[PDB]
Design a protein around this ligand. Structure first.
Ligand SMILES: *[C@@H]1O[C@H](CO)[C@@H](O[C@H]2O[C@H](CO)[C@@H](O)[C@H](O)[C@H]2NC(C)=O)[C@H](O)[C@H]1NC(C)=O
Ligand SMILES: *[C@@H]1O[C@H](CO)[C@@H](O[C@H]2O[C@H](CO)[C@@H](O)[C@H](O)[C@H]2NC(C)=O)[C@H](O)[C@H]1NC(C)=O
Ligand SMILES: *[C@@H]1O[C@H](CO)[C@@H](O)[C@H](O)[C@H]1NC(C)=O
Ligand SMILES: *[C@@H]1O[C@H](CO)[C@@H](O)[C@H](O)[C@H]1NC(C)=O
Ligand SMILES: *[C@H]1O[C@H](CO)[C@@H](O)[C@H](O)[C@H]1NC(C)=O
Ligand SMILES: *[C@H]1O[C@H](CO)[C@@H](O)[C@H](O)[C@H]1NC(C)=O
Lengths: 13, 180, 188, 180, 188, 13
């Protein structure tokens, strides 16, 4: 199996 | 509840340093070496059962570098407040004279994640088989970390885990020495 | 050395009853203050502090960003749980139990008998003392569980005694890693 | 800076318990007995100089009870997370046999401010001149507290401070005994 | 036992260089999260977390509430600082210094020499170790300052040695309660 | 002399 990472959302500008 | 799996990652400036790791119930599962760009399992055995794409992490951090430059400005440049460590030297298992053991230096409740830990045997620094862990997270948003020194007990020696941290007035020495 | 600035991001999955019931909680932490979070049981972002307002409102707009996060509970949480279960959830190293008194002194003199249990995993274990087969609930001083940081725990459970000859002290350890309790006696 | 004076007061529910006190550089100046409705100086000496109107506090707490009922609701009824104590038994001055001393049970880093401390000498409870302090505040919004047991060293005894707290799996025994 | 809810309120006066500079800081804390505060250096209330917004804006309206708090710095801080300065600010209890080695060993084998300093007030003190007159800065292991909660401090400062015959160890304590440093020697 | 206490404001309703 693969560890599923979660992605980072860029902040509001 | 019963278990918690956590993906904790951070980026720190000016240092420009980040970390990305997974934690299960307090222990580190693995973390991605930003430099070599490779995932490093905590116990080799873990790598034999699962995988993780180290680039995944490098990607994530890219955004973190960013969100940080953002957030800093909006905070109005407010810096972090140094919270000094809570060091305690422990031992892996009951010490028996002349039978190998390992000395654990436990550094807890501190922030920012930057700290210098030295081991000293009889006042002198030691690198013999010494090692450490990355900055493990904590619910209070402070950090945790470990340093290990494999040693062989005898009545002749005494040791010190020498911790330097910005929220500390000066280098903290935490002492250990066999007792009869 | 200049001021420091810390950005931190954590997605935590809390599993209840095994897998039936999972909670994703995504937190963004600037310095030591959490600013915004996604809590699966509330379906959307919420600023905790003012600086998290922009984003809680921004990301909350992207019905796609919110569409996935709500599913991350099986696509991410239940997933990662079944990936390592073999070695994390089901990890079992066995406790190594030792009984020894601290401070060799004469009989009939107060002595603190130590039960060191080290090397185990998971952290859940039970240590009881018995003095002559009858459980001794009082004068039991414990260090509580101690996490070694290497995927093994350790703890010390001491019994305050005033040993008379022949009294036999036993340390009983129960741990998921074993079928029948580990015991270890000590003779006066 | 140089000194801080703090008026810390709080109210807790369901317990329905509140405290009102002044602190100067970490040491308690006085606190108001909610029951007797009277200010209690920490060192009697303090009362022969300054005064405080205990009713002032009973007034303030009223509001605190109020603001609490309000705030709980708006929080959406998020209760407090028990943070168990960090106990350590110490001693006032180096112990000499037959030379009177005191054993200090230090309880730190906990919340909610509720906790049961018992002194035990030889497995048995002890009330002989024992005393305590109210809940002293800390910057992290957790509490601090002391219990003192005046004693007289002897090779014949061993002590324990027994602390009970909600965030603890079971009564914590912190031990002491003279060492020759 | 049901869930708990804690509301706490703190007004803290920080005095710098005496009374030349004072800063009132009023903090309202719900649970472990501070929600709103008044900081004399900023003149008005500020919500730290969203739950403190209503009040931060409410109270900020009440220009009379804002008028006083800004004067509290003299009507409250300096006043009270004046109301007990003799017994608080002006206190000095003297340190009681002791030097004893731990572990009664024959000579030449490593020993940890303890310097206990207790019973003093204020917390500010300086302990240095000397070996035959020369200051020993290394191998010095301290417990840091310890507050006894009864208006007195204590601390232990240990020196790791390997005592040879004739080595003379001194502990020099400096404190505001004393004019010339307290010292206390120990012979090998 | 007397210790001057500071009063608690009621929250917003
Ligand atoms: C950790 O140790 C390093 C030295 O090993 C400390 O030194 C760095 O910072 C100094 C102070 O400004 C510089 O003058 C040094 O050249 C620089 N050297 C290196 C090797 O980093 C550093 O301050 C310590 N870090 C912490 C957190 O205390
Ligand atoms: C301190 O001791 C009292 C009992 O002496 C504890 O008991 C109260 O709470 C118990 C556990 O929730 C209940 O079973 C009892 O009804 C209640 N008993 C009394 C006499 O009030 C109390 O919880 C203890 N405090 C802490 C912090 O654990
Ligand atoms: C932001 O920072 C600058 C410099 O610290 C300061 O002068 C200014 O008043 C600050 N403004 C706010 C709203 O914090
Ligand atoms: C408030 O609390 C209830 C029950 O604890 C929860 O189900 C509800 O969704 C909460 N509402 C918000 C806005 O947090
Ligand atoms: C939750 O745990 C298991 C996991 O499959 C489930 O089958 C069971 O019905 C539930 N048990 C309890 C006690 O809720
Ligand atoms: C501030 O405090 C004193 C007390 O009045 C004053 O005399 C002195 O000049 C000032 N010192 C400093 C360093 O600010």
């Amino acid at each position: 199996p693969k560890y599923v990472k979660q992605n980072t959302l860029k902040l509001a500008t | 509840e019963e278990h918690v799996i956590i993906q904790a990652e951070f980026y720190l400036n000016p240092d420009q340093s980040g970390e990305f790791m997974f934690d299960f119930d307090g222990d580190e599962i693995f973390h991605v070496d930003m430099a070599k760009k490779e995932t490093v399992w905590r116990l080799e055995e873990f790598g034999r059962f699962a995988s993780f794409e180290a680039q995944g992490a490098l990607a994530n951090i890219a955004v973190d570098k960013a969100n940080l430059e953002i957030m800093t400005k909006r905070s109005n440049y407010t810096p972090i407040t140094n919270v000094p460590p809570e060091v305690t030297v422990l031992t892996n298992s009951p010490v028996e004279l002349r039978e190998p053991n390992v000395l654990i230096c436990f550094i807890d409740k501190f922030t920012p994640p930057v700290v210098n830990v030295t081991w000293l045997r009889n006042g002198k620094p030691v690198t013999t088989g010494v090692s450490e862990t990355v900055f493990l997270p904590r619910e209070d948003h402070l950090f945790r970390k470990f340093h290990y020194l494999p040693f062989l007990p005898s009545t002749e020696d005494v040791y010190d885990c020498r911790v330097e941290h910005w929220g500390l007035d000066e280098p903290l020495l935490k002492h250990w020495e066999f007792d009869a | 050395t200049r001021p420091r600035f810390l950005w931190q991001l954590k997605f935590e999955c809390h599993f209840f009853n095994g897998t039936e019931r999972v909670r994703l909680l995504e937190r963004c932490i600037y310095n030591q203050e959490e600013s915004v979070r996604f809590d699966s049981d509330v379906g959307e972002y919420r600023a905790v502090t003012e600086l998290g307002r922009p984003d809680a409102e921004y990301w909350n707009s992207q019905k796609d960003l919110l569409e996935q996060r709500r599913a991350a509970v099986d696509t991410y949480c239940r997933h990662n749980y079944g990936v390592g279960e073999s070695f994390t959830v089901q990890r079992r190293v066995e406790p190594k139990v030792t009984v020894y008194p601290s401070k060799t002194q004469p009989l009939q003199h107060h002595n603190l008998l130590v039960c060191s249990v080290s090397g185990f995993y998971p952290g859940s274990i039970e240590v009881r003392w018995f003095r002559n087969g009858q459980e001794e609930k009082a004068g039991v001083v414990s260090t509580g569980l101690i996490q070694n940081g290497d995927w093994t725990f350790q703890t010390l459970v001491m019994l305050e005694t005033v040993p008379r000859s022949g009294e036999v002290y036993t340390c009983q350890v129960e741990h998921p890693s074993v079928t029948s309790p580990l015991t270890v006696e000590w003779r006066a």
